[PDB]
Design a protein around this ligand. Structure first.
Ligand code: CLA
Ligand code: CLA
Ligand code: CLA
Ligand code: CLA
Ligand code: CLA
Ligand code: CLA
Ligand code: CLA
Ligand code: LHG
Ligand code: 5X6
Ligand code: 5X6
Ligand code: PQN
Ligand code: SF4
Ligand code: SF4
Lengths: 80, 158, 38, 172, 741, 183
């Protein structure tokens, strides 16, 4: 599976979660930023590693990071 | 030196002159004296003579072609050294006035707009001020205005 | 004034400056042909 | 509105206080370039052309030295004195004067007019009257000398003939 | 119902927006922060349906832009006529068509480039032209420079009028959407008005000007001594001397005694033995017959008078039990999408350019074209390339339609929907056919190279070993040879001498003769079948999977043109429809390169050449195609290596520009590989270090330097690949054929 | 009967052009049937008309004056003034080369600035304020309009006249005065 990590500079903009075509990510309550919420990656077993989440992340550098890992039927996006 | 001789005294060089005239005359033979074809080919024949006479003073290889010396020897200054100095004067001018204009644009309200839509009066001002760029550049260097500080320049993590 | 702004756009000034430059170099080679040295 | 060309609007950056103002700038070069530079350039090109026009006139029978015996033919003369190494001494001396008179600020970017209107290089040893219509008299003589000089050299290139001999009774 | 409706003074004529780069785009109007903006400005300038959501505003830009294109074409044509008038040996060439080389470009004497002013004859020195303009102008009856000058001036007036009309129909009188959607009216006018009256009015020129001028030229009358065209119209006795039917006037036309015009309107077939061109009486009659067909055809579609067909009713009627709702929706598709129309129109115009290439070499329509081998080779090759580019474009716009304009509601169980619903069956079968064709076409060459290298000539696919006779093509040649007096009873000769019958010579040079098909011809035809099927695979896959695949289920949302959907799913580089077009271009280049090489070699080997007094044909490459063109080594050695001799030996001659362009084109081709093989990540990182050095010297630009986009890298790559590859062949071909032809 | 609203005075059947209101000195007729002023700038067209008027008038008088007598030192072989033969001679003399220079000088340094001023709407087309002798009066008076109307009517006549001059000389191969005297 791929590894998806959320770093503390997340501003809780929700753009990564909206961008994810596999529903890997969700917004969770968090006091660390003014938005009152942080990206979370609970379903990385479904992550294809498309990095649409990183493309969407406005922080410099990225608050969400995708480390491509061991390939599976799911991660390779295979319908056979 | 047997490898290089003055082109004036080089037989291969004289042979090349003769060959180039002969080829032009072999073409000229198919035209009738007063014709444009004849006069055009005659013009080229006249310039062949003038060229080979001009390059006579250069050193020639055994090929009978002018070979340029670029080692700093003053006897060959006209071949490289003088053209080299002229090149650096012109391009130093281009670079300097370009830097001058670029520095002007960064003081304006929309610096990027002044890079794609030139302030022509300001461009002309800096372009006409390039003629003493080596002194201008020296004065900026001495005054600590030429270079940005290491502290102030963005770099990637090492 | 808008036409002059257009004529100040990068591609127009580049075209005109390089035309002028090319003209000077072409005309120098017309009058001083075959200059292999200074 | 322009006095010289009433059908055209007045060149905005020009002013009647400037010496030799007719509001004559149909190409609007006073919009393209700073007037103070153009003004300085005009009077200088004038002053140089003035001396050039006298040089050709006085070249007849007025102080020819033991280093004379050279033709007045423009291009052959230039080629001779460059080869001699006289023009290179004149170049550095004019280069010296330019730096001295302008006090370092020689560039179009650098040249400034703090307590001096364009043309005022602080050369008035006899102390003749300056701040008046005398500036307009310099300009008119300078403008005439620039066209004058152009008329001399083109006459010298056309039929290889002497400047002052032309205005006797000769046609091409 | 069919009405003219325009909006007046819709756009003010102001330079304001000229001084606002990227005014047309909401994304670009704000101006650059990076160099990417400069590229984007150009990439997006004509993508009108990205600028605005209004189909009306898109339509009006298109109509006005079209006038811009015609204006430019008129400047170019005008140029060609003016260069003919002012800088050509055309007049001299008319008096010696076989001896003088056409020339209409003279170079200035500077840096020694006047070497390119070749000894072309006719009292000028210039570049030998291969456009066939002289043969066109001779067919048109042009005999003097005044006629060419007046055409050039006429061209500039048409260019001016096109510019006025483009300006006028955008700024002053812009037609409404409902004007443009009059497809029935448009087709009636374009069929009857453009093609019908074009062909009728041209037939008029031919009968009144071309025919009499060319009959006198072919008889050997001095072009200066020929009466000016208007004298044939004014003095009917002049015309009646040449074509006696002109005695009877127009009475035989209105009374249906049409056989009286047997002199001016013929069905001779074959070629003039004098000019090696089609008989102009055949061409005049062709154009009359076509004109009638088109004027009749353009009465098909209903406009304002009840009569005629509804194209909507026609499409919806063509419904069978195997194809669901059939052609339901396609009328809506083609009246609401410019891209859909551009897709069809490019496919057909491209395919037409290719048909033109084949028809023009084999039935040389212009006098002294057939034996001007440079022109024959140039015209075939040129029209092949234009055709190839247009067909790939059809793929691009078909796919743009699928991404931007396609709706499931319009295309519900219609032929388009049903195609998408078995795209897997379509692409799997076409994939298979490509592997079958590739193995059994290219494999035969590799088999042959191997057998020849192993000293096993008796084990080869060849005319002298294991024969693959194109028996169906051979059989069709026979039928076309037997046609005149038989299945074409009133035809005196074959449509083309390419099929059989006689060898036509003009002077000593072969105009046309039977093109015999053997094993080498069978093999290269299966290469062409192969390269076309693969190109179709790439472009069709692009269209059918433009909106989604099993890999990218939401591909339509990512758009037509996007680099990838990231390295996940194993990697999704070049999934976009745009990337299929990118790959399609290389295969089109591959396919057409082999077509024009097949043409060049076959014509030189087996057709073009000299016929002696004895009457023995000596071909340019002496029949080496049959035994050399059945191995790749034969193509490398007997074609590229042997025929490149002219271009590489061109230095110090008038053809030296071809030598230079040959190397220049190789350079540009190789340079392309830098863009195609690399990725912008490398380049952006390099630029960071270069930007550092500029920052250090306080000379870094405010418009931040960026590496080209991933897509632009590909666009630059394929553009330089094609420019380099095509220009290399151009220099090769022209140097070769101007030398040996 | 006539059209509904304002009709063109010169052509009472055609509607009056929107821009031509009859106020202009030599434009009482409002004569624009092909509707050039409807699409093109009036200030441009007026500048062109008045320019053509002044060029044509000098040219028509030039032909007549040159026909009556030419200067000696200008060895004019052709008596036909609007012939290629004469034109070609005074190109090779450098006479037409000289007047081309000062015409080109005028057009670039005067005519083009003057045209741009008129398009901005800060100059009446044709106005260079040239009246040393004051045969027009004050700029904008009823006397000025009469002369302005006179200029165009004289210029329009010369423009057409020059057509007659050129074309008749091209057929007959005779002088304009020579043609009048001899049939
Ligand atoms: C004022 C403009 C200017 C100046 C002073 C410099 C100066 C420099 N460049 Mg840069 N460069 C420029 C423009 C300029 N460049 C532009 C427009 C590009 C994009 C093509 C580059 C791309 C570039 C690269 C890829 C590299 C440099 C490098 C360098 C450095 C080494 C010398 C060199 O290779 O120059 C020669 C530069 C080139 C051949 C690039 C093109 C230069 C253009 C044509 C000049 C443009 C002039 C400008 C339009 C003038 C307008 C002024 C007017 C409005 C008043 C030196 C700091 C090198 C470096 O980093 O060295 C440490 C290096 O590898 N430059
Ligand atoms: C763009 C820059 C440029 C420059 C600096 C010059 C400069 C010159 N031109 Mg050239 N010229 C140019 C472009 C240029 N020209 C172009 C693009 C054309 C083609 C239209 C010409 C066609 C041309 C002709 C026909 C002549 C000149 C002549 C001249 C010389 C006149 C003194 C001068 C050296 C004249 C000359 O002195 O040569 C005999 C001359 O007769 N030029
Ligand atoms: C990249 C390096 C390069 C260099 C160093 C040269 C150098 C030269 N070339 Mg070559 N050339 C090149 C690339 C290069 N070229 C390329 C890529 C092509 C193909 C387009 C050519 C095609 C070419 C031709 C066809 C010719 C030349 C010629 C020349 C000579 C020109 C002298 C001149 O213009 O008058 C002198 C110019 C100046 C002194 C410039 C002065 C600039 C201003 C006005 C000075 C202002 C005062 C401060 C010079 C030796 C010519 C030659 O004569 O060869 C012997 C010649 O005919 N070049
Ligand atoms: C007889 C009627 C007629 C003719 C001849 C044409 C011809 C043309 N139309 Mg079509 N058009 C028509 C009716 C006609 N249209 C009608 C009724 C509609 C609305 C239903 C359209 C809607 C339409 C659109 C939306 C577009 C066209 C376009 C075109 C051009 C296609 C490109 C081409 O082949 O260039 C061939 C070029 C020529 C033959 C040279 C120019 C010809 C000019 C325009 C005049 C031709 C007609 C004129 C009466 C000739 C007088 C002959 C003279 C001896 C008196 C072509 C000029 C396209 C275009 O390019 O527009 C600019 C385009 O986008 N047309
Ligand atoms: C010489 C260069 C080369 C070759 C050989 C190939 C080969 C192929 N390309 Mg590729 N292509 C190329 C360049 C090449 N391409 C380039 C430069 C690009 C970038 C533009 C592409 C982009 C591209 C695309 C986008 C597509 C292709 C496709 C194809 C396949 C076409 C179907 C086919 O004929 O398969 C059969 C194989 C051949 C014809 C090659 C040789 C066959 C030999 C002679 C016979 C079999 C030999 C035998 C089995 C060997 C046994 C030996 C072993 C035991 C040691 C084929 C595999 C298409 C495809 O996949 O179609 C289904 C496809 O869609 N190519
Ligand atoms: C030569 C250039 C020329 C130009 C630029 C103008 C321009 C103008 N005229 Mg003037 N006019 C001219 C010559 C010209 N005229 C001549 C010779 C006469 C005498 C007949 C007139 C008589 C006249 C009157 C009575 C009036 C004008 C008016 C005007 C103004 C409005 C009408 C217009 O837009 O015309 C644009 C004209 C052109 C663009 C030139 C014509 C171009 C065509 C295509 C030439 C060829 C047509 C055709 C082949 C001719 C022969 C056909 C047949 C009869 C044999 C405008 C400023 C009106 C005005 O308001 O005055 C202030 C007005 O009332 N004109
Ligand atoms: C504007 C300048 C101009 C100039 C320089 C001339 C010069 C000349 N005119 Mg001309 N003339 C002019 C305007 C001009 N004219 C005008 C506007 C008219 C009215 C149409 C005439 C009507 C005219 C007539 C009728 C005659 C001359 C004649 C002459 C020649 C007299 C030679 C002589 O006797 O000593 C002389 C070349 C005479 C001539 O031809 O010399 C034999 C002559 O008989 N002129
Ligand atoms: C052309 C021949 C096409 C024969 C297909 C048969 C044919 O014409 O049938 C056409 C047949 C007609 O269906 P309908 O009667 O419903 O058609 C009514 C129409 O008005 C709607 O399109 O439609 C099909 O079954 C779809 C085609 C599938 C066919 C699959 C094979 C396709 C590959 C063909 C390979 C040979 C190509 C050789 C080219 C030289
Ligand atoms: C001024 C200014 C610029 C500033 C550029 C500034 C910073 C440059 C920095 C240079 C660096 C720090 C070291 C430079 C090192 C110089 C090298 C080491 C040259 C050694 C000489 C060789 C060795 C010649 C030998 C020989 C000669 C002697 C004679 C020949 O004949 C034989 C050879 C064998 C060629 C710009 C860029 C903004 C543009 C603007 O426009 C003007
Ligand atoms: C090329 C040639 C050169 C000279 C060429 C050059 C200048 C010649 C140009 C000819 C022009 C001026 C013809 C003008 C055509 C006049 C039209 C045709 C009049 C309008 C139509 C009427 C009919 C309407 C009027 C009326 C209307 C308005 C109102 C009504 O009430 C009354 C009527 C009366 C009908 C050279 C010399 C330099 C040398 C070169 O080597 C050869
Ligand atoms: C070489 C290369 C680059 C580097 C090339 C770049 C950035 C383009 C170079 C820009 C050229 C040189 C034009 C810039 C010139 C300026 C406009 C200045 C002009 C000055 C005068 C001529 C007017 C990529 O960015 C890239 C991206 C993706 C895949 C492959 C590649 C790739 O192969
Ligand atoms: S896009 Fe980036 S900043 Fe926004 S919620 Fe996701 S990780 Fe946080
Ligand atoms: S290599 Fe380039 S094109 Fe391929 S997935 Fe990565 S970013 Fe996208």
């Amino acid at each position: 599976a791929h590894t998806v990590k959320i770093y503390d500079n997340c501003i809780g903009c929700t753009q990564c979660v909206r961008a994810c075509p596999l529903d890997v990510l969700e917004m969770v309550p968090w006091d660390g930023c003014k938005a009152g919420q942080m990206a979370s990656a609970p379903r990385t077993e479904d992550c294809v590693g498309c990095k649409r989440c990183e493309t969407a992340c406005p922080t410099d550098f990225l608050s969400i990071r995708v480390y491509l890992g061991g390939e599976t039927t799911r991660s390779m996006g295979l319908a056979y | 030196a047997d490898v290089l001789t003055t082109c004036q005294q080089n037989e291969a060089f004289h042979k090349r002159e003769a060959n180039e005239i002969r080829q032009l005359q072999n073409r000229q033979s198919k035209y009738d004296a007063n014709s444009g074809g004849y006069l055009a080919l005659q013009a080229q024949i006249d310039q062949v003579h003038k060229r080979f006479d001009k390059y006579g003073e250069l050193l020639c290889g055994q090929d009978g072609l002018p070979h340029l010396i670029t080692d700093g020897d003053w006897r060959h200054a006209r071949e490289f050294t003088i053209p080299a100095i002229l090149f650096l004067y012109i391009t130093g001018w281009i670079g300097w006035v370009g830097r001058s204009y670029l520095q002007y644009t960064k003081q304006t309200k929309n610096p990027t707009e002044q890079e794609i839509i030139l302030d022509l009066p300001m461009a002309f001002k800096y372009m006409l001020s390039g003629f003493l760029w080596p002194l201008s550049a020296w004065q900026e260097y001495r005054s600590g205005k030429l270079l940005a500080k290491e502290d102030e320049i963005s770099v990637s993590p090492r | 004034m808008n036409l002059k702004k257009y004529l100040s756009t990068a591609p127009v000034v580049a075209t005109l400056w390089l035309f002028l430059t090319a003209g000077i170099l072409i005309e120098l080679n017309r009058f001083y042909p075959d200059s292999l040295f200074y | 509105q322009s006095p010289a060309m009433p059908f055209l609007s007045k060149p905005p950056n020009l002013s009647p206080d400037m010496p030799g103002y007719r509001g004559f700038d149909p190409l609007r070069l006073s919009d393209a370039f700073d007037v103070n530079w153009l003004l300085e350039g005009e009077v200088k090109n004038g002053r140089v052309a003035m001396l050039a026009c006298l040089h050709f006139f006085v070249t007849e029978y007025y102080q020819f030295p033991f280093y004379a015996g050279a033709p007045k033919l423009a291009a052959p003369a230039h080629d001779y004195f460059v080869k001699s190494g006289a023009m290179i001494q004149i170049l550095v001396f004019i280069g010296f004067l330019e730096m001295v008179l302008h006090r370092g600020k020689v560039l179009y970017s650098d040249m400034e007019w703090k307590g001096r209107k364009p043309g005022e290089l602080g050369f008035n040893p006899l102390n003749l009257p300056n701040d008046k219509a005398m500036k307009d008299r310099e300009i008119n003589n300078g403008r005439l000398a620039m066209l004058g000089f152009a008329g001399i050299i083109h006459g010298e290139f056309l039929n290889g003939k002497m400047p002052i001999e032309q205005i006797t009774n000769f046609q091409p | 119902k069919v009405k003219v409706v325009v909006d007046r003074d819709v756009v003010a004529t102001s330079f304001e927006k000229w001084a606002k780069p990227g005014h047309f785009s909401r994304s670009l109007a704000k101006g650059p922060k990076t160099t990417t903006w400069i590229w984007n400005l150009h990439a997006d300038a004509h993508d009108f349906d990205s600028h605005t959501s209004s189909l009306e505003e898109v339509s009006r830009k298109i109509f006005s832009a079209h006038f811009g294109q015609l204006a430019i074409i008129f400047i170019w044509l005008s140029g060609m006529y003016f260069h003919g008038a002012r800088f050509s040996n055309y007049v001299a060439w008319l008096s010696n068509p076989t001896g003088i080389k056409p020339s209409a470009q003279v170079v200035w004497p500077i840096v020694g480039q006047q070497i390119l002013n070749a000894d072309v004859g006719g009292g000028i020195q210039g570049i030998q032209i291969t456009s066939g303009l002289f043969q066109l102008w001779r067919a048109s009856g042009i005999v003097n420079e005044l006629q060419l000058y007046v055409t050039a001036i006429g061209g500039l007036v048409m260019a001016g009028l096109m510019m006025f009309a483009g300006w006028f129909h955008y700024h002053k009188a812009a037609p409404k959407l409902e004007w443009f959607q009059n497809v029935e009216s448009m087709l009636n006018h374009h069929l009857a008005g453009l093609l019908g009256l074009g062909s009728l009015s041209w037939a008029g020129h031919q009968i009144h000007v071309s025919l009499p001028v060319n009959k006198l030229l072919d008889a050997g009358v001095a072009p200066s001594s020929i009466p000016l065209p208007h004298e044939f119209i004014l003095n009917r006795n002049l015309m009646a001397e040449l074509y006696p039917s002109f005695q009877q006037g127009l009475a035989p036309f209105f009374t249906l005694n049409w056989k009286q015009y047997s002199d001016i309107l013929t069905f001779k077939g074959g070629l003039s033995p004098v000019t090696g061109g089609l008989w102009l009486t055949d061409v005049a009659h062709h154009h009359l017959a076509i004109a009638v067909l088109f004027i009749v055809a353009g009465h098909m579609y209903r406009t304002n008078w009840g009569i005629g067909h509804s194209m909507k009713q026609l499409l919806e009627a063509h419904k069978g039990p195997l194809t669901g709702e059939g052609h339901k929706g396609l009328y809506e598709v083609l009246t609401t999408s410019w891209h859909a129309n551009l897709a069809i129109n490019l496919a057909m115009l491209g395919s037409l350019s290719i048909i033109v290439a084949h028809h023009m070499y084999s039935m040389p329509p212009y006098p002294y074209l057939a034996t001007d081998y440079p022109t024959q080779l140039s015209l075939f090759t040129h029209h092949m390339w234009i055709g190839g580019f247009c067909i790939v474009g059809a793929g691009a716009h078909a796919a743009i339609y699928m991404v931007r304009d396609y709706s499931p509601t319009v295309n519900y169980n219609n032929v388009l929907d049903r195609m998408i619903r078995h795209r897997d069956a379509i692409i799997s079968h076409l994939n298979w056919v490509c592997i079958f064709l590739g193995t059994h076409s290219f494999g035969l060459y590799i088999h042959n190279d191997t057998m020849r290298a192993l000293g096993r000539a008796q084990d080869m696919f060849s005319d002298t070993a294991i024969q693959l006779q194109p028996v169906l093509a051979q059989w069709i040649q026979q039928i076309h040879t037997l046609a005149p007096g038989n299945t074409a009873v009133n035809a005196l000769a074959t449509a083309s001498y390419a099929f059989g019958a006689d060898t036509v010579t003009v002077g000593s040079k072969i105009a046309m003769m039977p093109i015999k098909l053997g094993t080498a011809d069978f093999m290269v035809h299966h290469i062409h079948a192969f390269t076309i099927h693969v190109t179709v695979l790439i472009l069709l896959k692009g269209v059918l999977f433009a909106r989604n695949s099993r890999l990218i289920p939401d591909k339509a949302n990512l758009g037509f043109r996007f680099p990838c959907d990231g390295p996940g799913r194993g990697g999704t580089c070049q999934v976009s429809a745009w990337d299929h077009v990118f790959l399609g271009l290389f295969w089109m280049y591959n396919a057409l390169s082999v077509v024009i090489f097949h043409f060049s070699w076959k014509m030189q080997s087996d057709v073009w050449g000299t016929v002696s007094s004895n009457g023995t044909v000596s071909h340019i490459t002496g029949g080496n195609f049959a035994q050399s063109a059945i191995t790749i080594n034969g193509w490398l050695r007997d074609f590229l290596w042997a025929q490149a001799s002219q271009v590489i030996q061109s230095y110090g001659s008038s053809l030296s520009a071809y030598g230079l362009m040959f190397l220049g084109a190789h350079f540009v081709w190789a340079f392309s590989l830098m863009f195609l093989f690399s990725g912008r990540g490398y380049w952006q990182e390099l630029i960071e270090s270069i930007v550092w050095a500029h920052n250090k010297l306080k000379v870094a630009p405010s418009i931040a330097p960026r590496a080209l986009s991933i897509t632009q890298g590909r666009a630059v790559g394929v553009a330089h690949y094609l420019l380099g590859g095509i220009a290399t062949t151009w220099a090769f071909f022209l140097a070769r054929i101007i030398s040996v032809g | 009967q006539a059209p509904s609203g304002a009709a063109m005075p010169s052509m009472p059947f055609l509607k009056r052009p929107s821009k031509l209101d009859g106020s202009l000195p030599g434009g009482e007729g409002c004569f624009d049937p092909l509707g050039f002023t409807e699409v093109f700038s009036l200030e441009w067209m007026r500048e062109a008309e008045v320019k053509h008027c002044r060029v044509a008038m000098l040219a028509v008088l030039g032909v007549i004056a040159q026909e009556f007598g030419t200067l000696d030192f200008y060895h004019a072989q052709s008596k036909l003034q609007l012939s290629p033969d004469l034109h070609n001679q005074f190109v090779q003399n450098g006479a037409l080369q000289q007047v081309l220079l000062f015409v080109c000088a005028w057009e670039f340094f005067v005519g083009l600035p003057a045209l741009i001023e008129s398009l901005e709407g800060r100059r009446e087309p044709g106005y260079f304020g040239f009246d040393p002798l004051k045969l027009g009066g004050t700029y904008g008076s009823a006397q000025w309009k009469r002369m302005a109307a006179g200029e165009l009517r004289n210029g329009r006549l010369a423009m057409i006249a020059f057509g007659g001059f050129f074309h008749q000389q091209l057929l007959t191969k005779q002088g304009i005065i020579e043609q009048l005297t001899h049939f």
